[PDB]
Design an enzyme around this catalytic site. Structure first.
Site, PDB file in Angstrom:
ATOM      1  N   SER A 174      28.656   8.602   1.322  1.00  0.00           N
ATOM      2  CA  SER A 174      29.577   7.564   0.889  1.00  0.00           C
ATOM      3  C   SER A 174      30.917   7.713   1.594  1.00  0.00           C
ATOM      4  CB  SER A 174      29.769   7.616  -0.623  1.00  0.00           C
ATOM      5  OG  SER A 174      28.585   7.200  -1.274  1.00  0.00           O
ATOM      6  N   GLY A 201      28.829   4.951  12.177  1.00  0.00           N
ATOM      7  CA  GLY A 201      28.397   4.450  13.470  1.00  0.00           C
ATOM      8  C   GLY A 201      28.071   5.581  14.413  1.00  0.00           C
TER       9      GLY A 201
END
Ligand code: NA
Ligand code: NA
Lengths: 4, 241, 241, 4
Positions: free
Chosen positions: C35, C94
């Site tokens: 998270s 990413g």
């Protein structure tokens, strides 16, 4: 025109 | 003294800096890479353009991959303490992340690492400009009608073309990108911040050039250059007396 | 009328444009992605910042890869004829070339292709800004003491970090890059061209942030953002009345 | 501080  | 600003790189050192031009025209037959007709026009245009910006220009022709690495290592070990900036221009074949020596490839990362803020101490905090006329892949743009600092800080990559794309060179006039870069530096280096000069270069390449080819695959194609900035300040080639 | 210049994008259309914010905080357990504590601070800061620039802001939270693609396809098919520009902000995990949906990756190329000059005709010739807070790899910066236009034209990628590198996010304050971007837009959007705003962002991230970690591998690390410009004109968020 |  030519490409590299 | 009065209020002070430091939004721009100090470019009033005794020397502007080195401009290393690597001009690879003829490649070893075994590589199968074609000769780059027109690149001498580019190299001569860059030499004159950066001469008038007061760079100490060094032109190198037809370097092997070994010579490219040794040259960039040696240059990075010079004392740049009295120099404002560093410029390297690479004219060669390429693919994404790669520039070719006459006998094989060089990783661009290996070239630029020699100048990292922690590895070239006399260039720490100074702009390091890498201007690259080379392919980045084989895509063609069809166009459409209309206390510490990071070691990667203070680099600028002025790429001739978008990631993944061929770059175009005219055998008589030179490359679209280098032609346009020199024209825009000649016209605006005493007027505009460098990112704004490079933006004019983007527009000139994007609007004034289109390929002509008897081969339909390569005909009527377009190009956009690619500015990659890790700079931390504005860059003006002039200073106030 | 008198002499005319067109060095800057027309930003006086009826609307500034859309600002799409994709805020991915919670990921599917099966992906194993952590998270992203602090990203809501980023999303709220961006919403306010671009609201004051008069963008039509749309915040989307916790989108799957399928939802990201469908959203960007749908947005690209809207009529942007009355809009000056387009902004997309991606907040997620990413790697190089990739942003993560909550259940898996999306190629950035697939997202941005929907807006190509030939595929989104109502945005042809208008600036398309992609602002990306996401890792680009796992490297850490140790720092050092001190008639047609190309289809890829008119894109700007404001990356939070250099190619290959992690990007840093603080669980309480938000990400270094988004914190700094919003601060610089708040202070200079009525004063500076966008590349010069982003250069101030580069300096703020590079100078004012350093990681703190009990893990020596991740401690005392630095970051430089990465501006990638295929723009053909200067971009000012204000216009003359 | 965390990485993305
Ligand atoms: Na070119
Ligand atoms: Na960041």
């Amino acid at each position: 025109d030519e490409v590299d | 003294s009065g209020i002070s600003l430091d939004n721009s790189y100090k470019m009033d050192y005794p020397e502007m800096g080195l401009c290393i031009i690597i001009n690879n025209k003829n490649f070893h037959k075994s590589t199968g890479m074609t000769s780059r007709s027109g690149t001498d026009v580019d190299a001569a245009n860059l030499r004159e353009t950066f001469r008038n910006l007061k760079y100490e220009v060094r032109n190198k022709n037809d370097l092997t991959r070994e010579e490219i690495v040794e040259l960039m290592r040696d240059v990075s070990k010079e004392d740049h303490s009295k120099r404002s900036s560093f410029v390297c221009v690479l004219l060669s074949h390429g693919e994404e992340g790669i520039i070719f020596g006459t006998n094989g490839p060089v990783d661009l990362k290996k070239i630029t690492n020699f100048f990292r803020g922690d590895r070239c101490r006399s260039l720490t905090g100074k702009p390091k400009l890498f201007i690259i006329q080379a392919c980045r892949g084989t895509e063609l743009d069809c166009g459409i009608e209309t206390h510490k600092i990071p070691v990667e800080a203070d680099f600028l990559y002025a790429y001739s073309t978008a990631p993944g794309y061929y770059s175009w060179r005219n055998s008589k006039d030179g490359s679209w990108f280098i032609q346009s870069l020199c024209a825009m530096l000649k016209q605006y280096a005493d007027k505009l911040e460098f990112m704004h000069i490079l933006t004019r270069v983007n527009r000139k390449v994007a609007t004034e050039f289109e390929s002509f080819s008897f081969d339909a695959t390569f005909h009527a194609k377009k190009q956009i250059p690619c500015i990659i900035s890790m700079l931390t300040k504005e860059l003006y080639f002039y200073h106030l007396h």
